[PDB]
Ligand binder design. Structure first.
Ligand SMILES: Nc1nc2c(CCCCC(F)(F)P(=O)(O)O)c[nH]c2c(=O)[nH]1
Ligand SMILES: Nc1nc2c(CCCCC(F)(F)P(=O)(O)O)c[nH]c2c(=O)[nH]1
Ligand SMILES: Nc1nc2c(CCCCC(F)(F)P(=O)(O)O)c[nH]c2c(=O)[nH]1
Ligand SMILES: [Mg+2]
Ligand SMILES: [Mg+2]
Ligand SMILES: [Mg+2]
Lengths: 274, 274, 274
């Protein structure tokens, strides 16, 4: 990790001086949710380029009455960021006073029961880069954030998932809310058929390229975490299919679901403990 | 990636000035195929050491009436190369005007139906280093080569595999041509029993230490790809076996198969699209 | 790898000139075995800071009559060491004249038949970082240590494991000695439920964060290898459990087991070929 403890403190102190807002919730907007900052009131925006130590914009504002800090644009391993840069904002959030992190992403559906446009609550994850030691916590532990060996078995808050199921029901959507396991791999290529079959056999329901390292750092520093995937495509599972994953369809799925995603997150603000 | 687009251009230009050959086919010769360059007519040879930006020798020549460029010797992750070095030649090939890449390798047989000396057409792959983000495409995307998120589900050209089956028949070899999934891992050690069992349970038929990153880059830049593995050993699947994988047996299998592999590739030239 | 053959040689020379002891056994003490040096007679201690090229202390002394060199403190990937630093001592031991390496660790129990406090003999391993090329042998091969492609299928000496079972039975312990496959991942976080389930389905019995690199380098240089894990916790396998892995209970389990682990290793010395 290239950052010192004091880097995170300096960045938090800088933000705290430059805004009077004091959010308890941070939201990292993945695909389909880039427009969520447009639902904020009393919005104050900082370009990442103007914030000390930041590797896009960070927006402080109020979402459905709740003070939030939002990343419009996140960082990815596939773009060449190390995980200690990808996750820098999460520790800054903790030092700002945030207590809950909401994460979202786009993902391919491995579970054959999913459909394009589904929302999948993340109940759990599989961190494939972590199996080989690629991990934002690699290196000396900063005890001022958390412990050397943090547990991940309770990462995705149970109460929030129950409340998300309730909220969804009250929104009266025809399509049910999905829930399952998100597997992170590095990307940026999409998977072969053989890779898709094995990922599904690992127990995964959705595959993507982000989120997990953010969650690990969030849990290490004691944040409550809730997340979901937008299912943008059903991954190709056989050789006979003329289907082929492509950015175009992912972008189009994101566009079609944007309103539903934003609405759902906005409504969920009410369920986050104060 | 330490190379700029202009680095690839410089190397392509250097080669195009040093030879008047204009190949449509590139062959990366894996174990057992090192002698293929000796079958070329009107061969012109360049040591890797002399070629600008190259991390063996590169040979331009005619094989069975088709103009080829051929890597005698390739680069491996286990020798300490990053994938952006391993795959440098593939993008150069595209800039030379190559349209089809033939790749080969040696591999251990995970499928118990394989025998030493079998050729396995590669129908698909599993990229284990890519699960952790070790990927030649990591970093900012070069759009002059291809898209940010390239698909891999159709990587191994279906027509070529059909024509390879037909070509093998024409050869009257008594051993059938195999076809299956190659899994790449870093190496250089051979697998434990527990590792072999889990790799077979992932759906892999053969295990090796190369090829996949070159295929990813090839597909990203639009090349047609055909590949195969020489099965040099049946991997050890139980603790009771007195068998043990060893380089000597791998070298011996390559020697015994060399003529058949060279003949197969030569004959396959007639089936590569023009 | 930052070390040349001469660096290892220099380090070995230096140790050989600074002690008269000529150990044939090396012990890398994992969790629970830190106190084993206290059972050494005629002990001479070198701080790692004293030894040329070393990335804790190295203790030469006599264990149950048998000359040993023991690492009190090993190096871990999760603390930011590359595997070429983690495994540096193993090659030094070979150049000292060591013929047998004993390794130990703490691990989480994936096999539901295990209980906290169990000792699991390592019959085999799964090297997940090695699947992505994170391997202490990556780079140019040094033939003076071993071959380019060393086999791992016979890594854990069969005779030593049989003798360990006999020793345990003669100790009269009522809990049986376990035996199985250890899977290494990077850490330092503990696993999610989904990860635990998939690792069990890979065929692993215990999961930890060390050892495997040391074993690969040991086998590459021809050392006999024996190892075990102390099972410090039963990994969480379902979402209904209120359990949660924690360092406090791992430390406590090691503390409780220490006197027995030290006794077991001490008695096992008699079973090493002389
Ligand atoms: N590996 C993989 N990833 C995806 C994705 C996610 C593509 C990248 C998403 C993103 F930009 F990283 P995020 O920030 O997670 O929304 C969609 N469909 C698939 C898919 O089929 N496979
Ligand atoms: N992982 C693994 N690799 C192999 C191999 C391939 C050895 C290396 C081949 C090579 F040099 F990398 P290539 O360039 O792919 O021909 C033969 N048998 C086995 C085997 O049993 N396991
Ligand atoms: N991945 C993983 N590791 C562990 C451990 C090992 C913790 C670290 C041990 C160590 F310090 F690295 P060692 O040198 O191997 O004793 C205990 N329980 C679990 C567990 O449940 N999961
Ligand atoms: Mg600073
Ligand atoms: Mg359903
Ligand atoms: Mg057959």
């Amino acid at each position: 990790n290239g950052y010192t403890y004091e880097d995170y403190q300096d960045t938090a102190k800088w933000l705290l001086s430059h805004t009077e807002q004091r959010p308890q919730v941070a939201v990292i907007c993945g695909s389909g949710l880039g427009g969520l900052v447009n639902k904020l009131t009393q919005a104050q925006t900082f370009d990442y380029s103007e914030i000390p130590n930041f590797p896009g914009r960070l927006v402080f504002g109020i979402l459905n009455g709740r003070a939030c800090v939002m990343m419009q644009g996140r960082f990815h391993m596939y773009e060449g960021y190390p995980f200690w840069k990808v996750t820098f904002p999460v520790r800054v959030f903790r030092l700002l006073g945030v207590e809950t992190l909401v994460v979202t992403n786009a993902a391919g559906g491995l579970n054959p029961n999913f459909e394009v446009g589904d929302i999948m609550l993340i109940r759990d994850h599989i961190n494939l880069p972590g199996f080989s030691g690629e991990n934002p916590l690699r290196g000396p532990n900063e005890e001022r954030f958390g412990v050397r060996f943090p547990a991940m078995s309770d990462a995705y808050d149970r109460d929030m998932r129950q409340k998300a199921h309730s909220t969804w029901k009250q929104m009266g959507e025809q399509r049910e809310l999905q829930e399952g396991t998100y597997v992170m791999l590095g990307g940026p290529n999409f998977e072969t058929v053989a890779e898709c079959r094995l990922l599904r056999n690992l127990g995964a329901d959705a595959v993507g390229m982000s989120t997990v390292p953010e969650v690990i750092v969030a849990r290490h520093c004691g944040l409550r975490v809730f997340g979901f995937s937008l299912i943008t495509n059903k991954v190709i599972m056989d050789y006979e299919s003329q289907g082929k994953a492509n950015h175009e369809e992912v972008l189009e799925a994101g566009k079609q679901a944007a309103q539903k995603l934003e609405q759902f997150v906005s409504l969920l603000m009410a369920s986050i403990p104060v």
